[PDB]
């Protein structure tokens with residue numbers, strides 16, 4: 055599918071709070087579709103979806119999520135709890151004069167669009183997650199009940215991930231059958247091969263983006279487990295009553311399809327897609343299959 | 358009507374050419390409506406329209422026109438001929454992935470949206486001008502032959518020196534209701550200035566606040582008046598380009614809004630536009646001078662929304 059060249063995009067900036075500006079690229083007219091990337095990614099992770107969604111008759115806003123790229127990256131952990139991130143995305147809609155948008159998220163972006171659908175359904179026309187399930191919060195078990203624990207203490211994972219940005223992205227952005235991960239990178243190649251999914255130029259784009267703020271903002275997404283759980287518990291097991299799509303990836307070994315298995319109970323209008331031979335990096339692993347699932351769903355449930 | 362606070366808008370940037378970025382503010386969803394200000398103004402000249410149009414179900418893009426604000430202001434006169442400006446607005450639509458927009462312009466922005474409708478009808482859903490008529494180009498007379506102040510504006514550096522000398526005085530002197538006007542535009546050249554016979558500390562017009570004036574002052578500190586005055590410095594090139602369009606009509610929905618008390622872009626200059634623009638509708642605003650959007654913002658909003666809702670959506 056047709057990709058994006060960053061020099062050639064419309065770049066938008068909204069100040070959602072005194073020290074906090076969100077960057078997005080914008081393409082197309084029609085219903086507003088807000089794309090929300092995961093860890094550790096970029097608006098550019100949607101490069102195969104932005105043109106296809108615009109061409110299908112949608113107004114695509116592909117965010118740099120807070121902590122990333124040209125969006126503000128404050129260091130404080132609590133700036134990256136779902137409650138703060140969601141309230142900022144509502145403010146974003148407010149300043150853009152959008153009564154609602156479709157929210158499509160992947161990974162930590164997926165977790166955010168579920169929270170948006172849960173707490174701000176009036177602002178969410180329809181919700182779609184790649185890989186990330188929605189599990190109702192259990193008020194009995196703290197988030198406690200290695201790599202996510204390694205990510206907890208500020209400064210540690212940052213030092214490993216920032217040491218060599220080319221190595222970081224070449225090591226992470228791999229098809230499931232190419233994976234070099236069980237530090238994160240202690241027992242992994244020092245000069246990893248290029249994955250079949252990505253080019254040198256695409257890797258160099260992520261390297262240039264992550265030179266702006268590095269990994270503190272991105273890693274802070276993982277450091278709010280207790281805050282996110284407390285906020286989720288306040289949702290009093292209400293249902294999500296808006297059109298919803300859950301897309302599972304067969305070969306995502308972290309966000310495994312089975313973890314989505316009971317979401318119909320809590321999300322009555324849930325549709326599903328499933329992409330075979332697809333690992334964690336869904337948009338760039340199976341961009342054609344993603345585009346067909348998203349557009350088929352948008353055209354039927356959102357337009 | 359509700360105004361805009363600049364800190365609180367979505368700011369967009371598109372590169373239309375190597376050295377040329379266009380800035381806009383964006384508000385609302387629905388059909389794309391691109392607002393094009395005149396001389397010497399700002400996206401902010403639409404401050405009363407942006408909220409009202411967004412609220413009426415439109416996606417408003419209020420430009421900084423080339424030469425202004427956060428948009429690039431290259432010094433070359435020919436960067437500001439209608440042919441270059443139009444091709445840049447088409448590239449702007451391209452990069453935003455808009456197949457078409459409604460184009461609403463005032464003053465020099467109005468001149469641009471007529472040229473857009475004329476040369477890029479496929480990219481223009483509908484066209485509206487405040488004050489600026491569409492006159493077919495006469496291949497017999499250069500606009501040189503056809504307003505001394507416009508000759509004063511020709512020579513690079515001259516009008517710039519007067520307009521940049523005191524930015525607060527410039528904007529307080531320009532942005533006035535017709536009955537408040539302190540400018541004679543008649544013998545500018547012989548007098549040798551727009552403001553030579555105008556108060557040194559002009560009173561604030563009833564139309565604007567100190568804060569609004571201070572916003573235009575801040576904007577015009579980035580590039581000054583060269584880019585804006587270059588809009589005036591392409592009379593021969595704009596006329597030659599316009600002649601190349603001779604005999605082709607504008608067949609898209611069109612609105613002409615005249616201002617009773619605009620003494621330069623006088624309503625009578627619009628008087629024969631039906632001949633060349635069969636689908637033309639009209640508004641007329643009484644007691645309204647040149648600065649239409651900020652003089653009669655309520656009347657402007659009603660005319661534009663009534664027209665958009667009937668002819669454009």
Ligand SMILES: O=C(NCc1ccc(NS(=O)(=O)C2CC2)cc1C(F)(F)F)c1ccc2c(ccn2Cc2cccc(F)c2)c1
Pocket residue numbers: 093094161162165186187189226230233235236305306307308309313333334
């Ligand atoms: O670590 C996470 N994702 C990134 C990831 C995923 C897979 C992979 N790779 S892979 O090929 O699958 C495997 C071999 C390495 C790589 C990464 C990364 F390297 F970037 F770390 C992640 C963790 C928790 C998340 C989310 C989103 C939400 N949570 C909360 C939540 C809570 C409850 C249920 C649930 F499913 C998730 C994301």
Ligand SMILES: O=C(NCc1ccc(NS(=O)(=O)C2CC2)cc1C(F)(F)F)c1ccc2c(ccn2Cc2cccc(F)c2)c1
Pocket residue numbers: 396397464465468489490492500531535538540541542618619620621622626646647
């Ligand atoms: O000088 C012009 N506008 C600015 C203006 C207008 C009125 C006023 N003020 S006033 O209140 O009316 C008067 C008492 C002072 C002030 C200004 C300014 F101060 F900024 F210079 C202008 C000139 C030609 C234009 C345009 C747009 C297109 N043309 C080409 C074109 C060619 C052929 C026919 C035609 F109608 C216009 C604009």
